[PDB]
Each structure stands twice: as structure tokens, then as C-alpha cells.
Design a binder for these strands. Structure first.
Ligand SMILES: [Zn+2]
Lengths: 241, 234, 219, 329, 280
DNA sequence: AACACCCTTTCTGGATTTATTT
DNA sequence: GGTGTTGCTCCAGAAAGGGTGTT
RNA sequence: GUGAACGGUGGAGCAACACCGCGUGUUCCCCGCAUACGCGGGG
């Protein structure tokens, strides 16, 4: 709702481990979530481990963890939330291309959290902000924090469909990488240099990296149709417990 | 289509006809079907097929070579290469210190195109005489020119049909001459012999881009040479 | 007192992930000057707000500088830059054998730990940068003349500046409200580009403990 | 404290780039499908906006060596030719956390947050090596700005201000070279007479038989395991041209400038980028300018006596305790 | 460490370069018109920045022999003339995988992605041969760097100008031969320079390099062995800038020779088996 | 005598691709 | 009035449990 | 206090061969078209 760790008690029903200490003295921020740890709040001292490679993403140096990030840091939560969108109603998947088309075009109208993994297993839940608005979406993709506007995605898709009219085959005006790693990620192709006007080329040139990453999934030969993702609330809940 | 050429090196040179008998002997006891496929035998009997031989032994400096025409001919060689290599290694390992047997393979595509000018092709060790009538035709140059003439043209037609490609039916070939004349024996120490031509030169308006075989006794490695090495010889 | 700022760079620079506000760069330059004056053992939060800019006071506090975020006029196609982090194991082996390094582990692990190998990619851009603000030009020009790089990854040579220019414009000419604004900001300043989010409206914009509800536009 | 170094590579420079590119036997790169295609690894290259007399300021390709590579090279030569012997002579040792922080800037020594006071931050930024390069669990900021290597080329008119019009090169400065790998077992002749192999002439025949069997199985399947034969190509930068390297120091002490000059003096026994087995990356220094003043001669650097004396004084007292305190706290 | 070798060829040197090039009855190379075209084979080539026009820098061709072939030649002559007789003596057979690993680096086409222990790296980098040429399943880094063979030519002044101000030739050094397969070769009687470097080597490794350099003269450089191309002689070997070559051999740097004698006295095949073994 | 350090399993879902570097 | 062969291989994850030591 | 500050694209590999010049000396077996007057060809 406000912090990424609110999902621990709001979306799913979880409680403190009861083996944690109770905070005494003036308050400090949680090292992972940026949530204040006031007087009487359960918390755990920070022992992340030598395999923790996210020191540059820590929010503070208080070396304290609230009882919700303790749940967020478990392995079932690490591999169960590899690609999902979190809303008050429940947890849904965005793994498939059609699910991404549903999310980045006509999103669900609520506060929600979007995370996507870029490797085998990663820490992503506690270092991504929640999105309070529908037309400005914060999405975390591995070590990248992106911003996606559905209007820009819709306009680009409409442009791509317009230029492809009257052709028996599909040709992409621009190249986008699903991994967002190629040197020519976002370039104008030779075919797109002849069927695109100057203002359209300038529009494609000036686009945020997150929109390029989304258009990588949404703009190919077979155009996916939006449909809702599979609900994985009970699967995650029973894996955690 | 294409013809596959496989080279076996035993560290010594053995003749193609002798290599055929050696391969027949070594694999006689086991895997008779593979030997029949190599030797183009009839499915039920030992007598060989009358049609154009797909698998024919050839000449190599360090051993013998195998040629396979068409998809079937290439497939037979593909399934036969490891067995033949193992048999060679076992044979040469029993006697002496032992040799290392190396192989090599190529896929040469076949082609032919018609051009309005004569082209020069030489043939080495080609057999032309099989019956008394052929011997009589060889007596007089006028009646023998046409005989060699049609023999060359019909050998080209037969190989083209067997490999599965169409050849232009307006080719005109001619025969310039031969360096030498010698006989070919089917089996060693047999009085019967077959007349042959050595280093014969033939002339066709068309151009040929692969391995092509002419004359009689093709499967014994007689009268076949690569046109590609001869075409723009380096 | 209304003026515009334009910056020329002779080198591709790292493309900013979020808005790069003019007041943040001015605060960095002012803190650098304070470090050169008083020494390295100073509190940067004492001097980072001592800027020659006016402040917009929203109802119920929540003030914000009268400075906008930089806009890019692209001159190159968008390209992507790759960098790698790795720790050598041959020299590590020699040092461990010689006793200079005190390690008791058997073998390195490239998946994680001290000897992890990592690859990461970031986009780069070359553009004209422009921004609008309200303040005194004489005060702004010196600080900007002290600046020689813009953007992130400044330690590997990204974003060398070639020149700058400050000029006055009309009151309607300069939009300074294209910036992260407070939630209670007067609806006149808020445009359709501004959307609700959780972001920083002041100070060091990377400090997550200071993020608040805000209306901000997408870069 | 601006330092500008001019170099000249004697061997090709090869800085590999990510990506899947292909070449033919001819020079055409990334051909349409239907032609024989071989893998190719190119150098590193970036697009820059070069203004020509036309003023079109179009985009042109420039071949460079990344600044991260040069920064790491400077760090490694400092650590190997200066810090390592001085620390070893005193009989000092480094823990894994201190070693990782000093040699790479890693934070895995104390992966949690490590706070530091303003006096503490100043006392580390005064240290020569710790002040030159930051990092560690503190994530401190260093005082070094290391730019990338730029060839003296007409495509680099924008980056290099002026004064390089002479001895400037134009045109291509890269070439594609081919490499091969051969199977040594197949090279064994029938004359053999090799008995180092355990099986003699029987093991080699087994190796050949496995090759033949694998080929037969693959051919049957067509109508994974990989052998030793290979044929591929890569792209290098031609030798003999000269480059420009710029390093900037932010309000440095004399000891830090002395350490930088010591590293520059002890250079030229190192290599740039990769291609280790082929002796790629060799170079010679032909000029060093110290704030516009030429201080490089045939034998080392002549000048900067205060810097050298300060660094000589600062080398003594170099103990592992400062490294341990910066690493862990 | 920074050994420089000067060599002379007595027969033409040929190093075919992949590609397609054409000649017309020796008159011209790659004419714009497709008239009297014939196939031609070129020797390996290297562009170098040079001073032409007295003030401007341009790229000019230079005929070289690639450093990969020289490194392989060094490996093979050292493995045949030195390591092989010492190994085969007193027993000590090698396995087939170890043989392939010693001759061509890896023994298979696929390397395992696992790392190797610190002790294995430390012991392998100290071996007289394995430490020189790296490789193996885990891709160990060797400490030998082999450059290419450059002729001492006025085009390579920006590469080797300081050392040889004089004794530099000029003009074409290539001749086209018809035998109708036409190829171009480097003319005999030419002086080349070869640079080899080692980083932090033991005395045994330097001794092994010198031993290999002693027996190298009977080998051949690139070329077509049927046409007896590629013969050469060795002179003017300089070690770390000091001349250590005589008409009868090296005759210098005795510590390296003693160290290599001791090292090859106690070589065993256990290290080869341990290095070649793949822990997949 | 308990925390520091090392080794060794294990767990998670989808699907396309361009080309300004002798 | 030449053509076949080779036509790439590895990887960039942290949690969790159990077995060992310094002291 | 420039959503900043910290980060090595690396390690191993022969373009030069392969396909060309080199032994047999006279009526024996099989396969088709015919339908034997003979043509074609397999070994
Ligand atoms: Zn938290």
C-alpha cells in the first residue's frame, strides 16, 4: 500500500517469527524497506551473508531489519516472485507475453508492485517502489528500475500496426532486445527508415528504457492479445508455509 | 545430384580391383547385407545388378577410395565407413607393429551445361572392348570412331539418368585419339582379357562439373576421373 | 530573474534513470566549493540548500526550489554500454600460496562471493541539455563555471562538458514546473504530464528514507 | 592536476565486444542467410558526434579502449609494482575482505551497511591509495577520473580539442584476421613410430573410430559433443598509431600524485586489453604532460621532485591496519 | 623475458590467406573489368601505420607470418625434441587425452564451466611446460607471449624503428609464381625479427625456451613442404637486450641451462594426467 | 563452547532476434 | 574451361542444512 | 550532497591440403529387348 513490505501482512497473512528483538530507543529506518522502526517494533539484526551482492542497494546503515523484510528475504519468496504483479486482491503472473500485454496495456486500476527477474534468483521485492498511479508504472527488471507509460506503448504499437498495413509479412520498424543488452538496442532498421516519417522516428528515438524493454516483448511478428495472468496467491502462500 | 568420395589411407597403395576383392573377403563372414550393398549384388543372389553401379571403388595414392552416386550411394557409404575402417585396423593390427588408418570425405555436386564451343577432357584407363563385334569395330578407324562416339555419349546419358538429373540431348562429342592400348584382366591368372584405351581424349561442347564415369567396368575403378580438377587445371 | 540554462557536452553521457533537476547539480557544485573552502570534514547537508534560487511554498509547508529538470535534444542514435566486474584468481592463487593473502577456502565461486563475475549494461546518450529556473544569473554562472562533468559514472570519463550559457527570458517563456512537485502543489502548476508517485522532491534524490507522495513527470 | 599521456602501440590492440557477429570467406559481415558463415569477434567501438566543416555533426564510428579497463590497469600496476613489495617487506598480510576491497573495490567483506563519520571520511580520503580509489563497504568516492584511450583520428576531433592536426591518421584502422585449430591425433602418420601413447597404435584407432561413429550418428539423425577442428576470425586494431590518455586528480596531496607518477614510470611492462597469448597490447610511452609541462624524457620522468619525495616519505608507514579499518570498521 | 630473435630465410615463405583474389597474366591484380581473370593466392598480410609523403601517416601493407603458427611451431619443436624423448625414456607413457591436451590445448571441444582449485593453479603455473602454454578443460592462462614474424622493412619503422635505423630494406618483397595455380611468396634472402616475452618465469621455463630455440633451425615455417618452401637459419639471438648467440649455439645464460637440465631430469607424467583430466 | 567458516543440494517459467568498424 | 573442410565452446544464484574449527 | 557514490570482457586454439603420372593381352559366366537374324550390359 505504501511500502513494498506491506504485502507481507496485507496481501498474504503472515506473522512475526517471535524470535526477534523489540526495538528500544529512538527510531531508525529499515535497511531493506526504508520503513521506520519505532519503539516496541519487532526487528532482527542484519546478518546478510558474504554472498549478498546488493550492498549498493541498501537504503540505510542502521543494520536493522523489520519483521516483514525477514519474510520477504526467504527463499520461497525469492523464487516464487520471479515474475509477478502484486495487488491488494492477490498475486498474478506476468511471465507470458500475453500477460505482459495485459499489464503494460490496460493495467489493473489499483496500487501494485511489479517485479521481474533477470537471472536464476535475485532480491527484487524490497528495493522497488510501489506504484500509486496507473499511468506511471515502476517495474524492476534485475538490476534495473524502469518506468513505463501505457499511453506511449499504445501509441508505438498503433504506429507499428499502421506501417505494417498492406504487407503480407510483418517487418519491425525498430529492434528491441528482450534482455536489453545489445549495442543496437533501440535502433532504426533499414526497413523502418523508409516507412517512418521524421517525427515518428524522433518519437521512437525519445523513449524511456522501460518502454523499450516492454516493446521488446510486445512488438514481434505475432502480436499477443491481452489476457489476465494466472493467480498464484495460494501457491506462494502454501510454499511459504 | 551429388557424389560422395571417401578416402582410406593404410600407409600403402592397393589397386581398386584388388581392394574390392579384399573388402569382399574380409567382410564375407559377417554382415552380408552391407557387403551386398557395397558390391551392388542382387537382393537374393550373389550375381551383381546389371544397372548403373552406384557404389564403385576408385584409386587413391595411399590406399583405395569409395565413390557413392546419388542419395542412396551416399547413404551406403555413410553407413559403411566405420565398419570398413574397423576391419582395416583389425587386419593391419594382427600382423606387424600396426598402422594408423585415416579417412577423408567430400561431397562433390554434379552438373552439366551446354556451351557453343568444344571442350577437352582426357580419360585414363578406360575399357572399350567386351565382345568380338567391338573388336571388329576397333579394326577400322571409321567404324571405330562412331563406336567410341556413341559409347561416350551413352555413358554420359546413363550416369545422368542414374544420378537423377536431366541432361541436354543435343550434345556432340568427338574422339581425338589414345596414347596407348592395353588389356584388362577380370581375375588374376585368367587367360581372358578385355581391350582398353589409355589416356584417351574426348571433346564435348558441354561442360561437366563433377565426377563422371564412362565406358565399361565402372565398379572396378576404370574410366572415371574428376572434371573439376581437369576444368581449369591448376 | 527568469532565465534559461543550456549545456554543451563533447562526450556521450550516461542517460539518467530519473529526472535530473538543476537544483541538485547546483547543490553538488555548492558542496564542492564548501569542501574546497572549509575542508573535507564538513556536513554536506549544511550547505546544499544555500543556492541562488527562489523557493515555491506550497500550503502546509513542503517547499520546493524554482528549478526544473533537464531536457535532452538528442544528436545521436541510442546505444548501450557494457561493463564487467571480475577479480583475478591467478594472482589470488599466487598470493595465497605466498602467505600474503589469508584465505582458507579451497576454490573460487564465480556465481557469488568475493570472486563473483558480473556483467551489466547501461544506455548512453549525446544531447543538448536545457532547463529553466528563477534566480540571479551572476550567482548561477560561477557555480556552473566550476562544473566539468554531468551525469553518472563520472569516474570513467562520461559526460565531459564543452560550454554553457545562461540568458534571461520572459515570464511566460520559462516553464519551471516540469519537476517533482508536492501533492498539495497549486493545480495551476500541475500539468497532464504529472502523475502520482512516491519520489523525492528535494535534497539528495537518491535517499529512499526521504521519499514522499508527489506528482512527477516521466523523463 | 591534469595528466595527459601519449602512447604508441607496437602490437595490435584487441578489446572484445559482446554480440553474435558472423563473417564469410569474403569480407562481407553479417550476410543474409544462405551463405557459408563463420563466427567473428570484433573490437570495441562507440558512436560519437564529429563535427566536420559542413557542420552536419553526423555520427561516426570510433575504436576505443574502455575507461574501466584503463582504470583497472592503473590500479593493478600500482598494487603490484609499489604497494605489494612495500607491504611484503614489513611482513604484512591481508584478510580476504581487505584484499577484495583493495584489489577490486568489493563490499563482500562487510556486506551490511557500514556508517562512517565526517572525520573518518576525511581521514580515509587523505590516504594515498584509499583516497585514489574508493569503494568497499563504505562506498567512498575516490579522487581519480580515468578517461578512455582515444586514437589520434579525424573521427575524434570532438573529444580532442586542438593541437593534434599534425600526425593525424584517417581511414580504417582495423583488420580481420583468421585462426584455426587442428586435431593432433589425426596428424599421426601411418609411419607412426610414436610410443608415448599408452595404447600405441590401438588408442589412436579408437579415437578415430569414435570420431567416425559420432559423425555417422549425426549424419543419420540429420536426415552437443564437439571435436577439435575449428575455423573462426576476430578483428583487431592495426599497430603503429598513437593514442591520447587523460587522467585527472581532484585536489590531490603530493603523495597521491607521486604514486600516480610511480605507476606511470613502472608501466610499459604491462599490456592493454586482451589477447594475452598473442602478445597483443604492447605499447611505448613517447610523452607525458604535467599540467601542460613536458616532464617525460628517454629514461623515466624528470621533474616533480616534491611529488616523488612526498611519495617516498609516504611509502614508509604503509601498514595493513589501515586496509583492515577501511575494509571492516 | 623479452627475448628478441633475428632470422633469415633461404627459400620462399608462403602463408596462404583465406579469401578470393584474381590476377591477369601477372599484369594486374583484381582489375575492374572481368577480362582475362585468373585465380591467385596471396601470402598473409598486415596493415601498419607508416610515414609516407614526409609528414603524413598512412596504412601500408606488410607481409608477415602469423604469430599463431609460430607459437604452434615452438610448441611442437619443444615437445618433440626435448619433452618427448625424456618422457618416453624410463617409461612414463601418456594417455591419449593427455597427448591431445599437450599438442592442441584442450582435449575436447566443450569446456566445463566449473572453476579450478587454487592449489591446482599454483602447481600448474609452476610446471616447466604446462605453465608456459596454458589451456586445459578449465582454460588456464599461460605465461608465454608469442608475436608474429616481421621483416625488417622501412614500412615497419613505427614498430621497430629505434632498434634498426640502418640495415632496413625497401621495395617489394613478393614474387608471383605460376606453379596454373598461381600464388605469391616472399623472396628468399631476407631478414626477419621475432619477439617473444614471458611474465614472471622460473629459470627452468627460460632454459626450456632456449633449448627449443637451439633445435628449431631444422624445422620449417609455414609454406608448402612439397615445394620445399620455408627453410630458415637462426642468428643474432638477444636475451633481455644482451647478445647470447654464437655460431655454435647460445653459449650464454648458464643458470637457465642448469635449471632446465634439473627440471627435465625429474619430469613425470602425473602432472599431464592431472591437467588433462576434466572434472565435468 | 558458541559462533565463524567451508561444502553440497535445490528451486523457480517463456520463447524472438538488426546490422554506419579494411 | 575448379572445388571441398571448418561454419565455437563456457558464464556472470543466493538460501539452507550439516560438518568442522579457533578460542 | 549530478537516483549519485563502488565494478577488467576475459582466458585456450598451425589455412594448406586433398582430388592428376604409375600392373594386366582374348572368348568365359550371367540380365533384358526380342523372340533368336541379333542388339544392347553386369562381372
Ligand atoms: Zn523493511
Amino acid at each position: 500500500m505504501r511500502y513494498p513490505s506491506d504485502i507481507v501482512d496485507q496481501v498474504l497473512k503472515a506473522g512475526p517469527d517471535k524470535g526477534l528483538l523489540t526495538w528500544e530507543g529512538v527510531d531508525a529506518a529499515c535497511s531493506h524497506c526504508s520503513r521506520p522502526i519505532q519503539n516496541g517494533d519487532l526487528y532482527s539484526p542484519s546478518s546478510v551473508g558474504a554472498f549478498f551482492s546488493d550492498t549498493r542497494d541498501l537504503a540505510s546503515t542502521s543494520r536493522s531489519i523489520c519483521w516483514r523484510c525477514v519474510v520477504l528475504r526467504k527463499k520461497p519468496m525469492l523464487y516464487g516472485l520471479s515474475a509477478a504483479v502484486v495487488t491488494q486482491d492477490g498475486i498474478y503472473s506476468i511471465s507470458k507475453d500475453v500477460n505482459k500485454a495485459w499489464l503494460f496495456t490496460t493495467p489493473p486500476p489499483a496500487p501494485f508492485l511489479v517485479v521481474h527477474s533477470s537471472s536464476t534468483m535475485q532480491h527484487l521485492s524490497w528495493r522497488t517502489p510501489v506504484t500509486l498511479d496507473n499511468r506511471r508504472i515502476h517495474v524492476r527488471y534485475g538490476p534495473n528500475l524502469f518506468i513505463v507509460r501505457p499511453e506511449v506503448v499504445r501509441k508505438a504499437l498503433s504506429i507499428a500496426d499502421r506501417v505494417n498495413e498492406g504487407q503480407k509479412k510483418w517487418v519491425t520498424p525498430v529492434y528491441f532486445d528482450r534482455k536489453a543488452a545489445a549495442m543496437g538496442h533501440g535502433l532504426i532498421t533499414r526497413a523502418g527508415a523508409e516507412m517512418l516519417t521524421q517525427e515518428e522516428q524522433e518519437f521512437f528515438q525519445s523513449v524511456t528504457p522501460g518502454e523499450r524493454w516492454a516493446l521488446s516483448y510486445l512488438m514481434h511478428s505475432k502480436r499477443p492479445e491481452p489476457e489476465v495472468g494466472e493467480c498464484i496467491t495460494e501457491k506462494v502462500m502454501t510454499s511459504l508455509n | 545430384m551429388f557424389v560422395k568420395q571417401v578416402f582410406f589411407d593404410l600407409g600403402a597403395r592397393i589397386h581398386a580391383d584388388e581392394a574390392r576383392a579384399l573388402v569382399a573377403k574380409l567382410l564375407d563372414d559377417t554382415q552380408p547385407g552391407l557387403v551386398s550393398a557395397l558390391m551392388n549384388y542382387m537382393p537374393a543372389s550373389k550375381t551383381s545388378k546389371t544397372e548403373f553401379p552406384l557404389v564403385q571403388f576408385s584409386n587413391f595414392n595411399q590406399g583405395f577410395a569409395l565413390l557413392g552416386f546419388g542419395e542412396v550411394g551416399a547413404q551406403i557409404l555413410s553407413d559403411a565407413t566405420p565398419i570398413i575402417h574397423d576391419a582395416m585396423a583389425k587386419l593391419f593390427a594382427s600382423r606387424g607393429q600396426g598402422v594408423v588408418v585415416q579417412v577423408s570425405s567430400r561431397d562433390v555436386p554434379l552438373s552439366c551445361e551446354k556451351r557453343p564451343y568444344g571442350l577437352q577432357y582426357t580419360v585414363a584407363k578406360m575399357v572399350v572392348q567386351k565382345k568380338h563385334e567391338h573388336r571388329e569395330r576397333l579394326a577400322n578407324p571409321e567404324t571405330g570412331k562412331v563406336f567410341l562416339e556413341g559409347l561416350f555419349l551413352r555413358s554420359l546419358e546413363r550416369q545422368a539418368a542414374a544420378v537423377g538429373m536431366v541432361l541436354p540431348r543435343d550434345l556432340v562429342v568427338s574422339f581425338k585419339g589414345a596414347e596407348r592400348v592395353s588389356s584388362v584382366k577380370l581375375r588374376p591368372d585368367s587367360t581372358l582379357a578385355h581391350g582398353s584405351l589409355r589416356h584417351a581424349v574426348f571433346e564435348v561442347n558441354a561442360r561437366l562439373g563433377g565426377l563422371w564415369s564412362v565406358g565399361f567396368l565402372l565398379s572396378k575403378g576404370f574410366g572415371h576421373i574428376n572434371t573439376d580438377l581437369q576444368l581449369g587445371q591448376g | 530573474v527568469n532565465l534559461k540554462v543550456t549545456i554543451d557536452l563533447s562526450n556521450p553521457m550516461m542517460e539518467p534513470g530519473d529526472l535530473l533537476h538543476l537544483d541538485a547539480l547546483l547543490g553538488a557544485l555548492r558542496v564542492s566549493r564548501a569542501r574546497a573552502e572549509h575542508g573535507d570534514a564538513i556536513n554536506p547537508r549544511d550547505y546544499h540548500y544555500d543556492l541562488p534560487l527562489e523557493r515555491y511554498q506550497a500550503p502546509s509547508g513542503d517547499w520546493v526550489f524554482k528549478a526544473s529538470a533537464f531536457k535532452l535534444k538528442r544528436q545521436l542514435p541510442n546505444q548501450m554500454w557494457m561493463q564487467t566486474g571480475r577479480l583475478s584468481i591467478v594472482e589470488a592463487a599466487r598470493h595465497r600460496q605466498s602467505g600474503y593473502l589469508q584465505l582458507r577456502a579451497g576454490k573460487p565461486n564465480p556465481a557469488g562471493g568475493p570472486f563473483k563475475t558480473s556483467i551489466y549494461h547501461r544506455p548512453i546518450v549525446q544531447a543538448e541539455l536545457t532547463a529553466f529556473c528563477v534566480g540571479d544569473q551572476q550567482g548561477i554562472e560561477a557555480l556552473l563555471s566550476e562544473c566539468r562533468q554531468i551525469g553518472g559514472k563520472r569516474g570513467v570519463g562520461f559526460g565531459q562538458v564543452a560550454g554553457f550559457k545562461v540568458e534571461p527570458v520572459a515570464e511566460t517563456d520559462c516553464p519551471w514546473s516540469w519537476r517533482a512537485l508536492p501533492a498539495d502543489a497549486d493545480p495551476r502548476l500541475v500539468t497532464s504530464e504529472h502523475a502520482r508517485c512516491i519520489a523525492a522532491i528535494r535534497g539528495p534524490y537518491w535517499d529512499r528514507t526521504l521519499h514522499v507522495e508527489a506528482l512527477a513527470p516521466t523523463p | 592536476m591534469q595528466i595527459e599521456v601519449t602512447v604508441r602501440n607496437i602490437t595490435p590492440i584487441f578489446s572484445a565486444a559482446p554480440g553474435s557477429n558472423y563473417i564469410t570467406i569474403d569480407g562481407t559481415i553479417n550476410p543474409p542467410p544462405g551463405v557459408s558463415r563463420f563466427p567473428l569477434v570484433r573490437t570495441r567501438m562507440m558512436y560519437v558526434a564529429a563535427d566536420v566543416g559542413d557542420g552536419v555533426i553526423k555520427s561516426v564510428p570510433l575504436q576505443i579502449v574502455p575507461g574501466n579497463t584503463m582504470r583497472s590497469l592503473l590500479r593493478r600496476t600500482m598494487l603490484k609494482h609499489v604497494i605489494e613489495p612495500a607491504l611484503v617487506e614489513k611482513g604484512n598480510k591481508l584478510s580476504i575482505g581487505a584484499y577484495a576491497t583493495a584489489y577490486s573495490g568489493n563490499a563482500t567483506g562487510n556486506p551490511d551497511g557500514v556508517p562512517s563519520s565526517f572525520d573518518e571520511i576525511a581521514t580515509m580520503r587523505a590516504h594515498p591509495f584509499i583516497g585514489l580509489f574508493g569503494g568497499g563497504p563504505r562506498m567512498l568516492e575516490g579522487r581519480l577520473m580515468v578517461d578512455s584511450l582515444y586514437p589520434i583520428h579525424t573521427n575524434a576531433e570532438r573529444i580532442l580539442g586542438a593541437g593534434y592536426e599534425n600526425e593525424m591518421m584517417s581511414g580504417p584502422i582495423t583488420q580481420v584476421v583468421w585462426a584455426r585449430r587442428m586435431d593432433p591425433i589425426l596428424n599421426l602418420g601411418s609411419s607412426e613410430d610414436v610410443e608415448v601413447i599408452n595404447g600405441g597404435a590401438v588408442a589412436a584407432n579408437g579415437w578415430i573410430q569414435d570420431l567416425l561413429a559420432n559423425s555417422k550418428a549425426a549424419a543419420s539423425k540429420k536426415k552437443n559433443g564437439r571435436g577439435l577442428k575449428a575455423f573462426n576470425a576476430h578483428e583487431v586494431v592495426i599497430p603503429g598509431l598513437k593514442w591520447v590518455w587523460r587522467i585527472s586528480l581532484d585536489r590531490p596531496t603530493d603523495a597521491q600524485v607521486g604514486l600516480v607518477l610511480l605507476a606511470l614510470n613502472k608501466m610499459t611492462n604491462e599490456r592493454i586489453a586482451g589477447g594475452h597469448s598473442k602478445d597483443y597490447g604492447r605499447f611505448v610511452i613517447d610523452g607525458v604532460s604535467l599540467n601542460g609541462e613536458q616532464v617525460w624524457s628517454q629514461s623515466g620522468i624528470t621533474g616533480g621532485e616534491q611529488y616523488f619525495d612526498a611519495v617516498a616519505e609516504a611509502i614508509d608507514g604503509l601498514s595493513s591496519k589501515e586496509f583492515e579499518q577501511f575494509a571492516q570498521s
